[PDB]
Design a protein around this ligand. Structure first.
Ligand code: CA
Ligand code: CA
Ligand code: CA
Lengths: 161, 161
DNA sequence: GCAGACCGTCGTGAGACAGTTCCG
DNA sequence: CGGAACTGTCTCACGACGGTCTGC
């Protein structure tokens, strides 16, 4: 199992070369709510240092998928899905600093999702948090994300709310 | 005073957004050997996230120099001197992964300096290590540093050895 | 004659997503 | 269907040093 010093190290590496984000994919095949919520944490590093990513990979119980080369000489290690993020994250949050807020919003999105997936009014409250995770990852001078406002006018126009 | 999980985080954060390096400063006013060897670890981060640097700073015993803006919207925190690094680095080495080697090599130079100060031949063995550190922070395809090849040239020209 | 600390910076290595296609 | 898994990219935020410059 994950040692406290192994969790702190990864917490610290993630704060620096890693990313905790969230997005909304347009799914043409979905029924009422035509969007998938994707939640992830990643580690980015030049392709030569690849073995170091693999090591962490092993420490986190081989969860997620490694990639030797995105296609620009960079390697990444990506972990999406609430299953893995509901077991990994809580082991890191206590040690995370810069991206602690992010991590806690993700966790929050996870526990609200089972009731929001077939209910437009709740899905909208969930998407509002999606917008917070994204803004937290932006400069103060950058344009804020607008997922909620665009889904609100789409849910009304569709008579879903 | 540093807890094992506090060190592990800093080693993690250092491997991510930090630097472990060494260099030769040309010093015209120095007598026999006119170079200063400089040993430093640094942390780099965008201007708005300065307060996280500070926490680390207070956590390491307030050693080094905080800097709110290098002048390009970026903030850093540098620690020079063998005096600080001989206390901080041994607390990090056991958790360091990506820049571990650089650390060990840096501790090495600290052991050899007292005798290399006034001895050109021993200062030359030291400068090899200064090249090694610099090489370690380069890609395989990059030019390797030449500090030994030119200071041997100098030392023969000047008749110092 | 010593060594700190105080100002700058080129050339990438990252971050934070997006588009498409798989999978039982 | 609904998610897990492959692709691929514009835009900075980093890294790893280099010159002066004090104030002894
Ligand atoms: Ca970072
Ligand atoms: Ca790095
Ligand atoms: Ca970085």
């Amino acid at each position: 199992t994950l040692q406290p010093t192994e969790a702190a190290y990864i917490a610290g590496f993630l704060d620096g070369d890693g990313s905790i984000y969230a997005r909304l994919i347009p799914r043409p095949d979905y029924k009422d709510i035509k969007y998938q919520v994707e939640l992830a944490i990643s580690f980015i590093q030049r392709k030569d240092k690849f073995p170091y990513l693999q090591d962490i990979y092993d420490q986190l119980g081989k969860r997620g998928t490694l990639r030797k080369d995105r296609g620009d000489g960079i390697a990444d290690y990506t972990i999406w899905g609430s299953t893995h993020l509901s077991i990994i994250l809580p082991d890191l949050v206590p040690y995370l600093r810069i991206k602690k807020k992010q991590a806690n919003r993700i966790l929050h999105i996870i526990n609200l999702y089972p009731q929001a997936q077939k209910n437009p009014s709740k899905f909208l409250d969930l998407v509002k948090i999606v917008d917070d995770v994204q803004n937290l990852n932006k400069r103060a001078d950058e344009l804020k994300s607008t997922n909620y406002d665009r889904l609100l006018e789409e849910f009304l126009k569709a008579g879903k709310i």
